[PDB]
Amino acid sequence: PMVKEIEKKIENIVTKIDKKKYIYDNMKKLLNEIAEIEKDKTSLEEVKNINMSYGKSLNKLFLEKIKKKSENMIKSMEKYIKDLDEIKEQSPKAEMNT
């Protein structure tokens, strides 16, 4: 204990300098969620692109490209009439919240 005061130093270099590792040991699991974050974000933003061309852009272009009108009817118009799913989502939210 006298010279073996270097045992409290060992005690320190132990637990104290051991729990030093169990910090960066969570810094990895962090750099996983952090990693996953953008890793999906961008991947999807890529399939949010294909829409803008195939929708909005290909819309105006096709809505200039021109029975045939019947297709133009069931087109963008019934494509908006799809969004009845929001009402098929609203009252549901307004359900499990009373």
Numbering used by the authors: 7 to 72, 76 to 107
What did the study's authors say about this model?
The second domain, NBD94566–663, covering the amino acids close to the nucleotide binding segment NBD94444–547, has been crystallized by vapor diffusion using 2-methyl-2,4 pentanediol as a precipitant in a form suitable for X-ray diffraction analysis. Peak wavelength (0.97898 Å) data was used for the SAD technique in which 12 out of 18 Se sites (6 SeMet in each molecule) could be identified by SHELXD that were further refined by SHELXE. The electron density map for the main chain atoms is excellent showing the typical sausage like features for the helical regions, whereas for the side chain atoms no visible densities could be identified. The structure of the NBD94566–663 molecule consists of two helices that are linked by a loop, which is not visible in the electron density map. The length of the long and short helix is 97.8 Å and 48.6 Å, which are formed by 65 and 30 residues, respectively. Due to the kinks from residues Tyr60-Lys62 and Ser85-Glu87 both helices spread apart by an angle of 40.2°, thereby forming a hinge-like feature. The longer helix of chain C in the asymmetric unit is highly distorted when compared to the other molecules. By contrast no nucleotide-binding could be observed in the constructs NBD94566–663 and NBD94674–793. In the crystallographic structure, the residues Gly61 and Ser85 of the N- and C-terminal helix, respectively, are in a very close proximity of 9.8 Å and the very N- and C-terminal amino acids of NBD94566–663 spread apart by an angle of 40.2°. This structural feature of NBD94566–663 enables this protein to move either like a hinge or like a rattle up and down, thereby transmitting ATP-ADP modulation in NBD94444–547 with up- and down movements in NBD94566–663, which have to be coupled to the α-helical and chair-like NBD94674–793 fragment of the C-terminal region of NBD94, representing an elongated protein with three subdomains of 96 Å, 35 Å and 20 Å in length.
The P. yoelii RH protein, termed Py235 (235 kDa in mass), has been shown to be a potential virulence factor that allows the parasite to invade a wider range of host erythrocytes. In erythrocyte binding assays (EBA) it has been demonstrated that Py235 of P. yoelii binds strongly to erythrocytes in the presence of ATP, whereby weak interactions have been found in the presence of ADP or the absence of nucleotides. In this context a 94 kDa domain of Py235 of P. yoelii, which is highly conserved amongst the RBLs and called the nucleotide-binding domain (NBD94), has been found to selectively bind ATP and ADP. Based on these traits and the absence of significant ATPase activity of NBD94, this domain was suggested to serve as an ATP/ADP sensor during the invasion process.
